[PDB]
Design a protein around this nucleic acid. Structure first.
Ligand SMILES: CN[C@@H]1[C@@H](O)[C@@H](O[C@@H]2[C@@H](O)[C@H](O[C@H]3O[C@H]([C@@H](C)O)[C@@H](O)[C@H](O)[C@H]3N)[C@@H](N)C[C@H]2N)OC[C@]1(C)O
Ligand SMILES: CN[C@@H]1[C@@H](O)[C@@H](O[C@@H]2[C@@H](O)[C@H](O[C@H]3O[C@H]([C@@H](C)O)[C@@H](O)[C@H](O)[C@H]3N)[C@@H](N)C[C@H]2N)OC[C@]1(C)O
Lengths: 203, 260, 178
RNA sequence: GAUAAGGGAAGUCGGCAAAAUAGAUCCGUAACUUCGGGAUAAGGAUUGGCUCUAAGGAUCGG
RNA sequence: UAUCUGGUUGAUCCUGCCAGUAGUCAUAUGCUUGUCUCAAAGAUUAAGCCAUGCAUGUCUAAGUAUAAGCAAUUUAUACAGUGAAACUGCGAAUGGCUCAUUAAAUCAGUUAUCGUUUAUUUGAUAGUAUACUUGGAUAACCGUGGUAAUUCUAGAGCUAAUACAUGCUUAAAAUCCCGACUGUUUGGAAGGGAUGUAUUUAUUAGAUAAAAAUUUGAUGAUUCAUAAUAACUUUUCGAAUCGCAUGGCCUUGUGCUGGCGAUGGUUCAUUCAAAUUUCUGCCCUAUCAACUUUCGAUGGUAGGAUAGUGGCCUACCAUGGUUUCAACGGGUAACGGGGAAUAAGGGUUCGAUUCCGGAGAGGGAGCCUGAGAAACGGCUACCACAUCCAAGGAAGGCAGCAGGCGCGCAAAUUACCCAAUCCCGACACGGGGAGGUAGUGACAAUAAAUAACGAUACAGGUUGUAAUUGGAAUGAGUACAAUGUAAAUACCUUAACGAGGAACAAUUGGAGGGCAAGUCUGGUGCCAGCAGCCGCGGUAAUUCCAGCUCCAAAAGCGUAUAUUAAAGUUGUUGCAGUUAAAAAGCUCGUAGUUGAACCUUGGGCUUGGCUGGCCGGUCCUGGACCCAGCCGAGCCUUUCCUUCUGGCCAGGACUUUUACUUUGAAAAAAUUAGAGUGUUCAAAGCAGGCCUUUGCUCGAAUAUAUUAGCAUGGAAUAAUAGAAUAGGACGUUAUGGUUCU
RNA sequence: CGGCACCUUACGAGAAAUCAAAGUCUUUGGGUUCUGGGGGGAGUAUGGUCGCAAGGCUGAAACUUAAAGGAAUUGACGGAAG
RNA sequence: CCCGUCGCUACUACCGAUUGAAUGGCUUAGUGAGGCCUCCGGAUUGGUUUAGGGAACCGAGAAGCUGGUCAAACUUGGUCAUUUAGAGGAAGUAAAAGUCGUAACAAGGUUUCCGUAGGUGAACCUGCGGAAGGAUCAU
RNA sequence: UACAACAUGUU
């Protein structure tokens, strides 16, 4: 099958090598997973040493990290917007490592609203401002008011991340290897990395 | 080729086993265990070729199936168990105890020891690091791991292991002036004292040693084994010869002194 | 398979097959010592050549060289214990003067006809072959058996031979019937 | 003026007549040679529709 | 043993080859063949083809027994012993065979994994936030059967688990999050969630420049070990298992407790291993000079894939990579090495093959299972071979052992056995053409018979020499016997036999020279034949064919081919080139090789070790000092030696690169050399030897390895760089300006 | 000082003829390029390459054979001299 | 002493129409078995369990199907290496006494030889320019 | 002026 040997290559001088043995099992390769966004479908592969890999064929959700806040939530992948290796992966919505995705911002919104007692998005929408104003003042005890007050100051986030929350979709990058671990995890894009990928996306 | 080897050709056997050339095609392949295949001494060899108790391998299996043989205080039923350096061999039915210690000749000599000394063993510390739950441990040269060792125990130190409990009694620091024994190379088996340790980062550490007769000989740090605190005071019983090298003329003279 | 067992050749034929002088010398040696063929002279020539080579190689070295002090004295010990050298020539210089007759004189056959056990050296070899000779209490039937200096005084007949305290051979036991 | 199973020049003085090939892009191309050629040698692959993307410019303004 | 002899001429001195001579773990062949020991053996050509039989199986008290199996009536009406079948587990990836492919590949010596997987062994290692113990299949078994045929199997009926699939039995507190209420200047709380280990991701620990305006592991080195926070997961596993004994506590309940083991299972370590990997090192060829990059070639970024690194693959990008210091291509009647023969030295040649590494199982390719295979005494397909058939179909892989055909100059029995060596299994028990034993066996090697001694007549010049006169000696052979062995056979011991032509009869090549040994006899007559070479043979042949005699080696001798020495006829050591073979017609010229001289030399003092001598001290031993000599060490001479801090080791900051030479670590056995040792000697083997048994005892040395690599002193020899448009060196305690840590 | 040469001797060389280099080479080593390895087949065949051609350069093997050859000596011979 | 052509015989190799033949390797293109991954599919089957009779509802899962991937094998064309048949032609070598002449060795009776160009049964002759290895070291 | 050649093999 697929082989990872280097003996089938030409020499560094350009010489053609002669075959030295038949293909070995300890030098095999396998087909790519080509993970798509869809209802979960994970297959198991028995590997060298009797070990076991998981090939993500389709995945709906992933574990995503907010690095500057130190909290990670299980949210929903909305799609792929950018892939450095190949734009065809974007076009077909193929999840690999380093792909830039949009995830649902809902769980992170709940965490931030519960934690700092504020709102994200800056969208004074018709029904949006109703929610924003209600979140501003809720039914809430006094020691919790004080803990939130102490938590303010470290409550504003950077503008570029904040402006995204009005859509419910945050930009993110996959960090796991879905074809290997069977999971599609990542972190929220922030800082100059976010600025770089926004510059690429606007083209 | 497709998997592990299970036979051992007789000419491929280690040269310290003193195997004859013509007894057969094969030699006992030592099992996996606490010592390296090349630096071990399988029990069948020890009880057949050395002690001469058994006449053949089938008698070695007849002996060992009846719980007679013990290594480090534990009964072994493996005819090819990889007994190695410092290992204590005990024969209860004959009430007889042995320790595998190199002689100056480079062989595992047959060394009878007392029952009181047949209750511990020395061990060279190979590494120390923390395990699961933050617990530190050291590894000896026989694949023994001991949890919660003394905070001062480092690599190349020697610990005194209590065989009944597997716990560390006391340890010897590696430094200048220590009584050591060479466990590899040309100077296998010779006992000396540390004179100067020479360091080479990324490469190999050399250790200058000196015998009781003042001859200095250098050896790789990997082949050193700390066996005593100072000159003349080891923590184990020495083979008949005290680990001292004689020239060929000297051994000829001593042979003709005790046989003529 | 089992390890191979060593084997070597113990002689070498001459480079020139037809030098008449040395042919006469070999014939004289065989006739004097009652040998069977020329190969028996070739074997002692082989042994003598290698001994002289060893002595020469050691004598390239200083009197203080340890390798000389060990191997040369071992060689001297072996030569003086087999009867080739006496108790006054232990210096490796007299090792170079040894001749084939020195080894021929120390054979079983030569010493058997020298002691008096047989009349002719041929009769000595003939007695040795028929197991009438015992060194110590061990019967030796090898005429090239080299006797050592501490073995010369124990050569005599075998207890079971008709020459040293035995019964009669088949010839006499058939000829005593009448 | 067309088509024809299986065969494929057995027809005939003779492949006469007919069939087969054919545009363009890419690949590949022998003997021989007056070195100019032979050469489209021989011989292979590709080609629609639709929806896109990229490259190749002109004139103004420091 | 650092060696030569014959052949060109009428004769000579050369060049030069032919021939002679010796060796071959070197093949074949011819003749001959008594004994003991040892021992190669279908590699060469055909990795050609194979009838037949065998070569891989395996159960302990401790996984599953209602055999309609045998035995017990005994500790037992749930089983209990022995024991087929079958389910489960493990092994079948070791071994053995062969050398086809293979030329930076294999391999060798050295490296690396801070780049990974690892059954098993050996150590450690888990109290985690219906339970006096859950299910329902299925095999074996009974019965109905189909096909010509296979180790084919189908309906149907039962029934087990350490098979399959589920599932609780648990400590003590403490920590983090949300937080109804409440006290109210920042506090108490009810009520909820999360705590082990695996998986995945993100983020935090994982420390250390000395005077005025707080503690932490390893490494040469890390994002290492480890710990923490937030979550994640088609939720990994933290024992629904087995055998022996069964004791202890009384609050006597069919209560609570608990000894030795079997088998398990997470992680780490360890061991047995794998996979990649650094440096350097291969035969012939230019009638191969450019190669690689279309379709990965060299590199970069991201991903995929893998056990893991890596163009290993994909996308995008750059235009790179090798080469006269020989790339690339071609040939190999090429698997590599340890090694072998020859051998003054230097060399030349061989190494399929007892050990190590690689590769393959007719040829390709693709896979299942499994820790481990791209396995072939496993599967799938195609090609080629080849088998059975009832014509529908089915079954294959001897480069395993033996055997056959073929091929050829060229190579053995379709034997016995697990007793030894050792391997495998659930295993003290079973299995093993692995292995051992015998058969064949002039491969090679060791020892070693085929005769010995008397007297008469002779003879000699005191026995060296003669025919015919006797008595012994014995092993070849045969065979009681024991021994040897798993059983044998053979050896060894041995009763009875076992020699005059001791017919129990030695051969193979020669007799002109090289080269040892006839001009003896008969035959033939340049014929027949011999003859390595020079030559012989034409009617007196020392050369042919024979007889006699003689020579050489002998249980062996000859022949053919390859190869080594001789060959200083491949020449670096070390050839030859005016005329014997051979200076390019002549100049230029790149690579290569090679290149003038010069830079710390002399002097003085002190002082360590060795050799011979005045002291002699002679028991080969050594003594103040002296005559000399050699090899070391320290200071001073303008004085080179890194610089600063502790104060002849232990710290920071520095360092022009090499060749060369010295010294060390390390470097499988076998083989080589070599020490010991009465295998009866020897080849060999690694044994063995003693006070005489309840034992004792020396041993299984020692050198050689080293091109390359890693450490390490020297500083001649030969290179390499420096300060010249000064952009040059030192200012340590010279001053200032900025800026960083 | 550079040249073209020559004469004598034999230091030393050589198989000798002869050589001031053909010497300083078994007492074997200043640097470097090319060529030869018994006689023939053969500078042939073949491939390549240059030339208009004639030809040049590069360049084997099978097979065959015991000498071919160099320098000198004595003799014999010469349509060689005295 | 000796040269070549010619005559008989034998052996070796070469050229050569035959778009000659065979063997081994590599390979473009076309076809393409079979695994593996993937996609559906759903013989059958147990109940995620619930149905008054079972009615909504879950888990396992064979053939087969889609798209890839490794890729045997065959057909055609190319290419490299080795071997090989052949009418005829042209050489070489070997083999007691066959033929023709006499080219060389003496000034070999025309001194010999080198290169080149013609000619001729053959050795060879002739032109041009060289050499002495000459038959002259010299007027 | 003209002058060509002398069978094979030895002792
Ligand atoms: C070896 N023994 C010698 C042997 O040499 C014999 O040889 C001559 C030989 O010289 C003669 O002479 C021959 O020598 C050479 C060369 C071969 O030597 C030949 O080429 C040539 O024909 C002839 N000159 C020749 N006719 C044969 C024997 N008669 O001369 C006599 C002899 C005693 O028989
Ligand atoms: C010296 N030149 C000669 C020329 O003279 C000729 O010579 C022949 C020679 O070949 C003949 O000889 C030849 O032929 C005979 C026989 C077959 O006839 C053979 O036995 C002999 O071995 C062979 N050499 C010989 N018998 C006469 C000479 N003139 O042969 C040609 C030639 C070679 O050019």
């Amino acid at each position: 099958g697929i082989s990872r040997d280097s003996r089938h290559k030409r020499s560094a001088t350009g010489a053609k090598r002669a075959q030295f043995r038949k293909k070995r099992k300890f030098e095999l390769g396998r087909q790519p997973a080509n993970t798509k966004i869809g209802p979960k479908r994970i297959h198991s592969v028995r590997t060298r040493g009797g070990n076991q890999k998981f090939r993500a064929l389709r995945v709906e959700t992933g574990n995503f990290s907010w690095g500057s806040e130190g909290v990670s939530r299980k949210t929903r992948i909305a799609g792929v917007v950018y892939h450095p290796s190949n734009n065809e992966l974007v076009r077909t919505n193929t999840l690999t490592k380093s792909a830039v995705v949009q995830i649902d911002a809902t769980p992170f919104r709940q965490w931030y609203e519960n934690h700092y007692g504020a709102t994200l998005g800056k969208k004074k929408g018709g029904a949006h401002a109703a929610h924003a104003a209600e979140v501003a003042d809720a039914k809430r005890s006094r020691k919790v008011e004080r803990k939130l007050a102490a938590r303010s100051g470290a409550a504003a986030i950077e503008s570029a991340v904040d402006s995204q929350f009005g859509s419910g979709r945050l930009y993110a990058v996959i960090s796991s290897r879905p074809g290997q671990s069977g999971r599609c995890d990542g972190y929220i894009l922030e800082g100059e990395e976010l600025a770089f990928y926004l510059r690429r996306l606007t083209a | 080729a497709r998997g592990p080897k299970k036979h051992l050709k007789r000419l491929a056997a280690p040269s310290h086993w003193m195997l004859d050339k013509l007894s057969g095609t094969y030699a006992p392949r030592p099992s996996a265990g606490p010592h390296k295949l090349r630096e071990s001494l399988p029990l069948v060899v020890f009880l057949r070729n050395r002690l001469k108790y058994a006449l053949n391998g089938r008698e070695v299996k007849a002996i060992m199936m009846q719980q007679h043989v013990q290594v480090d205080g534990k009964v072994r039923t493996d005819t090819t168990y990889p007994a190695g350096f410092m290992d204590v061999i005990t024969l209860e039915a004959t009430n007889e105890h042995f320790r595998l210690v190199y002689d100056v000749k480079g062989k595992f000599a047959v060394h009878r020891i007392s029952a009181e000394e047949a209750a511990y063993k020395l061990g060279k510390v190979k590494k120390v690091q923390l395990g699961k739950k933050g617990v530190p441990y050291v590894v000896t040269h026989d694949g023994r791991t001991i949890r919660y060792p003394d905070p001062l125990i480092r690599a190349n130190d020697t610990v005194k292991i209590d065989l009944a409990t597997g716990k560390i009694d006391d340890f010897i620091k590696f430094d200048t002036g220590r009584l050591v024994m060479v466990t590899g190379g040309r100077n296998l088996g010779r006992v000396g004292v540390i004179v100067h340790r020479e360091k080479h980062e990324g490469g190999f550490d050399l250790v200058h040693i000196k015998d009781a007769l003042e001859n200095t000989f250098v050896t790789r740090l990997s082949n050193v084994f700390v066996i005593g605190t100072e000159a003349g005071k080891p923590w184990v019983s020495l083979p008949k010869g005290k680990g001292i090298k004689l020239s060929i003329s000297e051994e000829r003279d001593r042979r003709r002194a005790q046989q003529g | 398979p089992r390890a191979p067992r060593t084997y070597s050749k113990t002689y070498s034929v001459p480079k020139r097959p037809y030098e008449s002088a040395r042919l006469d010398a070999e014939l004289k040696l065989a006739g004097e010592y009652g040998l069977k063929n020329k190969r028996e002279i070739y074997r002692i020539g082989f042994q003598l050549s290698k001994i002289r080579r060893a002595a020469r190689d050691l004598l390239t070295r200083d009197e203080k060289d340890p390798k000389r002090l060990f191997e040369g004295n071992a060689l001297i010990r072996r030569l003086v214990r087999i009867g080739v050298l006496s108790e006054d020539k232990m210096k490796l210089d007299y090792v170079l003067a040894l001749k084939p007759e020195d080894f021929l004189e120390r054979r079983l056959q030569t010493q058997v006809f020298k002691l008096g056990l047989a009349r002719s050296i041929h009769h000595a070899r003939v007695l040795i072959t028929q197991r009438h000779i015992a060194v110590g209490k061990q019967i030796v039937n090898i005429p090239s058996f080299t006797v050592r200096l501490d073995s010369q005084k124990h050569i005599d007949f075998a207890h079971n031979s008709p020459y040293g305290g035995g019964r009669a051979g088949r010839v006499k036991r058939k000829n005593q019937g009448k």
